[PDB]
Design a binder for these strands. Structure first.
Lengths: 434, 273, 148, 48
RNA sequence: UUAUAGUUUUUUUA
RNA sequence: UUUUAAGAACUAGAUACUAACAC
RNA sequence: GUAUGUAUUUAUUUU
């Protein structure tokens, strides 16, 4: 019972039902012609039909262009059929889900069993007294259709299920997760700047533990406000979701709760956004975010999540004030939009703008305060409200690129106890890139 | 609302600090800018001389018949109320702008441009704020010392290093302890509380009545009264200067153990009823 | 039916006075101004349809239809009108496009957006529908003022 | 270290009591001078 | 490392 | 009738206890 | 990873 209670959560079950069958709501939502389809008419599904097994009802009613010939009911793979026994227009699927066991691993007796009984039973709701059954045992990943038959679907079903059972993600959510629990996994770059919108989520700033006096003596844990830091690398409007410690009030360990409220914020932002401004990817260094992201990213197989392949320096985001100035002022959590690049899209492309920007983050990571002085050393040209980094001239940006660059190299050779003078180019490019 | 009961002239210089007899409510001790201290009847009783420079702070003791005065001369001087002669001189403070008398421990807490808080055995030095320390208070339980500095922070101290830091102020020039176990902290335009108060620019002391009324003295001469619970400002007054318009402000203030006593920069003490 | 009167008055412009955003007495007026300004944006997009994502125009109009009717009839809750007006107000300021997006983010999160240059809300389905299209008005405006 | 160790005989529980009791006494003193300063306003609030 | 985790003697190969 | 603290300033950190925080 | 414990006075008791 423990292990299962893992394997299903946030109604992963219900989500499964939607992903699969609703995605067929697409595939045969659009097939009109060849099967003589007027329109795709389905009844709005009460939320519980997925996990309640008491009794079932007609799901998705096919209402023919013209007319249809209902043979006596056979399976999907029960073959040879004389359709003309009847005619209908309106139809339906019964498509359901049950996790089988080493007694009943053959659905088909369940397929025709339930199908038949349902159809011939009162409580079963049907608009047409003809239809189709497609069940699945997620257990052995089996599936089947015992319908009445008017012609032409059979392979559309067959092959289409090859696709579904190989594709619609929630399945692959299981076959990920079941392998989590089972602990079987079989043994034996610049494109960040392409057209579609690529976003950066980095969560190390989301829940900040703060150590404080224990009434007696012990080491006390707490936290103070975070926020979720996302940007696209290109067009430079920051999405900060304010994290106001009220959020954490009563519950649990906040490691898991961190990761899951990060996921739900990022998702809610995505959903709310327009199809034009949505991302086509997401890129994070912290991979503890995989599962929360994913599980809330079932709903959008359009978007595709991709991790880091490469060592990356994002944890310094807060040490550059004005945004953190905003972090500590918030009475109640809210989004704020900002400007990453100061104005770097005039004097450069975003390209070496981002090279210099990573390098800035770096020298903010290793020695810190030396870098902060380097920036603000002469403040006598002042940062406006919208910029963040100290505003410069050409040469100032340029040499400061060089110097900030210099730190990790020199501090490196000193600190890590391997020399900078014996180096080879590609390890220099390595630490610079990562 | 509040209104103006009485005007008491009689200081030669400014009035920097005011404290009231914690037991009988029969008098004031008022510092000055003339170095003296003039003990007013809540008429002028007596004069306590003996500081060479202006007296920034004065505090009277509960369990003791002692009076601890402190000045810009780098010295914390005790006063024996009985015979009215200086008993003890402290040290460690080459000007000391705050004294607060810990309630139960027989301690003194002093602070000033040192940028450190000295706990005097009537012992500890608290390394701390990055600038001068304006206002210091004492509390019987944890944090036993609250401090406020011109680095715009307020620290809650564990005397036996900082227990907690409160940075929300954008110099904190005054605090007052609610007689609810909380503190009211001040800044230029925003008076907050700490376990908000609505303020337009009041820039640039606080006092807390036992009825949960929160006084705020202005440097523009405006007296901003608040409710403590809400944050609402139910009254704002304006004092009459005297027989310069710059000299109108409120340097210190206190409530008795239903009356308000405010030393003003015009060389007068005013009593608001 | 004063809402039937305000909608026929040609004495109201599209310009939003931020000092009116939270006014109780000016609610009916501000509501109509938001209606008028949105129509004006859709009008300029129309006039240059071929140049800016013509394939998204129709869907945007359809999603905004119910909002506009409500604005015309002063049917929006106080907090909702306040947030929308704030977004549209900043949008009318070219150099404040970022403040408009920031306000938009609050609205989409269910929080009240107050003018930034100068607590909570609830979101419904059809409501979520027009809040999404508002972002399209913002992206169009940025493109429009940038390409002329 | 040892010279400091020998000198406390009790164990965590007793020390915990020492604290709790003193904290009670601070509560008393506080609540008192509450009532004292309320008497200096003359309004007499009874003790719980 | 997760859907936890004081008693449930805590930890070894062919 | 009681009492008297050597005083002030500057400095780095080692050994420390612990941390529902980072493999 | 927790049991366990503590306070949570709003509606004016006669001079």
């Amino acid at each position: 019972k423990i292990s299962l209670i893992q394997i299903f959560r946030a109604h992963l079950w219900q989500k499964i039902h939607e992903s699969i069958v609703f995605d067929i709501c697409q595939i045969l939502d659009g097939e009109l012609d060849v099967l003589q389809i007027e329109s795709v008419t389905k009844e709005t599904v009460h939320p519980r039909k997925s996990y309640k097994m008491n009794s079932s009802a007609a799901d998705i009613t096919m209402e023919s262009v013209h007319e249809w010939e209902v043979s006596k009911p056979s399976l999907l793979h029960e073959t040879n059929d004389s359709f003309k026994g009847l005619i209908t227009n309106k139809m339906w699927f019964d498509v359901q889900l049950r996790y089988g066991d080493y007694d009943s691993h053959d659905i088909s007796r369940y397929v025709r069993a339930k199908f038949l009984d349902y159809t011939t039973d009162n409580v079963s709701m049907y608009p047409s007294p003809t239809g189709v059954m497609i069940g699945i045992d997620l257990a052995y990943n089996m599936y089947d259709a015992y319908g009445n038959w008017f012609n032409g679907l059979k392979p559309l079903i067959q092959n289409s299920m090859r696709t579904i059972m190989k594709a619609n993600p929630a399945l692959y959510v299981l076959r990920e997760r079941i392998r989590k629990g089972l602990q079987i996994y079989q043994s034996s770059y610049a494109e960040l700047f392409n057209n579609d919108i690529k976003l950066f989520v980095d969560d190390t700033n989301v829940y900040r533990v703060t150590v404080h006096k224990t009434f007696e003596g012990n080491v006390a844990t707490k936290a103070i406000n975070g926020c979720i830091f996302t940007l696209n690398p290109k067009t430079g409007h920051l999405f900060l979701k304010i994290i106001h410690t009220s959020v954490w009030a009563g519950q649990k360990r906040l490691s898991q709760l961190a990761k899951w409220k990060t996921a739900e914020e990022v998702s809610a932002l995505v959903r709310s956004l327009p199809k034009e401004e949505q991302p086509k990817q997401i890129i994070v260094t912290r991979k503890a975010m995989l599962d929360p992201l994913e599980v809330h990213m079932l709903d959008f197989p359009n978007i595709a999540i991709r991790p880091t392949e490469l060592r990356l320096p994002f944890s310094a985001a807060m040490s550059i004030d004005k945004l953190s100035d905003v972090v500590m002022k918030a009475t109640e959590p809210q989004m704020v939009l900002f400007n990453i690049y100061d104005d770097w899209l005039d004097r450069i492309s975003s390209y070496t703008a981002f090279s210099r920007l990573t390098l800035l983050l770096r020298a903010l990571k290793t020695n810190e305060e030396s870098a902060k002085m380097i920036l603000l050393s002469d403040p006598t040209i002042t940062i406006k409200s919208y910029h963040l980094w100290p505003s410069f001239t050409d040469e100032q940006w340029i040499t400061i690129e060089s110097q900030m660059r210099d730190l990790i190299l020199t501090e490196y050779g000193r600190k890590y106890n391997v020399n900078i003078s014996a180096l080879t180019q590609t390890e220099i490019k390595d630490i610079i890139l990562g | 609302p509040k209104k103006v009961i009485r005007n008491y002239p009689g200081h030669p210089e400014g009035t920097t600090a005011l404290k009231f007899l914690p037991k009988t409510g029969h008098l004031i001790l008022s510092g000055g800018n003339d170095h003296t201290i003039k003990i007013w009847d809540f008429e002028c009783l007596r004069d306590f001389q003996g500081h060479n420079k202006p007296i920034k702070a004065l505090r009277f003791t509960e369990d003791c018949q002692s009076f601890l005065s402190s000045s810009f001369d780098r010295s914390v001087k005790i006063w024996d109320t009985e015979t009215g002669k200086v008993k003890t001189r402290l040290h460690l403070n080459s000007p000391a702008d705050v004294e607060s008398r810990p309630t139960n421990p027989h301690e003194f807490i002093v602070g000033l441009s040192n940028s450190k808080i000295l706990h005097y055995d009537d012992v500890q030095t608290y390394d701390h704020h990055l600038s001068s320390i304006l206002a210091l208070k004492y509390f019987p339980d944890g944090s036993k010392f609250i401090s406020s500095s011109e680095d715009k922070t307020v620290r809650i101290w564990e005397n036996q290093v900082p227990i907690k830091q409160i940075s929300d102020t954008a110099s904190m020039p005054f605090l007052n302890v609610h007689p609810n176990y909380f503190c009211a902290q001040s800044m230029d335009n925003r008076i907050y509380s700490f376990s908000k108060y609505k303020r337009h620019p009041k820039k640039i002391h606080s006092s807390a009545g036992y009825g949960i009324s929160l006084a705020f003295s202005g440097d523009g001469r405006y007296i901003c009264s608040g409710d403590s619970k809400s944050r609402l400002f139910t009254w704002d007054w304006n004092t009459s200067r005297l027989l310069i318009p710059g000299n109108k402000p409120i340097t210190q203030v206190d409530w008795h153990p239903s009356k308000v006593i405010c030393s003003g920069a015009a060389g007068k003490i005013y009593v608001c009823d | 039916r004063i809402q039937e009167a305000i909608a026929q008055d040609k004495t109201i412009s599209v310009i939003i006075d931020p000092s009116q955003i939270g006014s109780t007495e000016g609610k009916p007026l501000l509501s109509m101004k938001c209606n008028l300004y949105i129509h004006e944006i859709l009008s300029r997009w129309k006039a240059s349809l071929e140049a800016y994502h013509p394939e998204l125009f129709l869907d945007t109009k359809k999603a905004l239809f119910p909002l506009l009717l409500q604005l015309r009839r002063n049917q929006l809750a106080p907090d909702l009108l306040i947030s929308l007006a704030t977004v549209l107000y900043h949008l009318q300021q070219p150099k404040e496009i970022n403040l408009a997006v920031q306000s938009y983010m609050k609205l989409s999160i269910g929080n009240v957006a107050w003018p930034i240059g100068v607590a909570n809300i609830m979101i419904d389905e059809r409501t979520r529908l027009w809040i999404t299209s508002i972002k399209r008005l913002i992206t169009f405006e940025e493109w429009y003022t940038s390409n002329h | 270290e040892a010279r400091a160790r020998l000198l406390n005989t009790q164990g965590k529980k007793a020390t915990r009591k020492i604290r709790e009791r003193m904290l009670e006494e601070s509560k008393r003193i506080a609540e008192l001078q509450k009532r004292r300063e309320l008497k200096q306003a003359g309004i007499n609030v009874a003790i719980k």
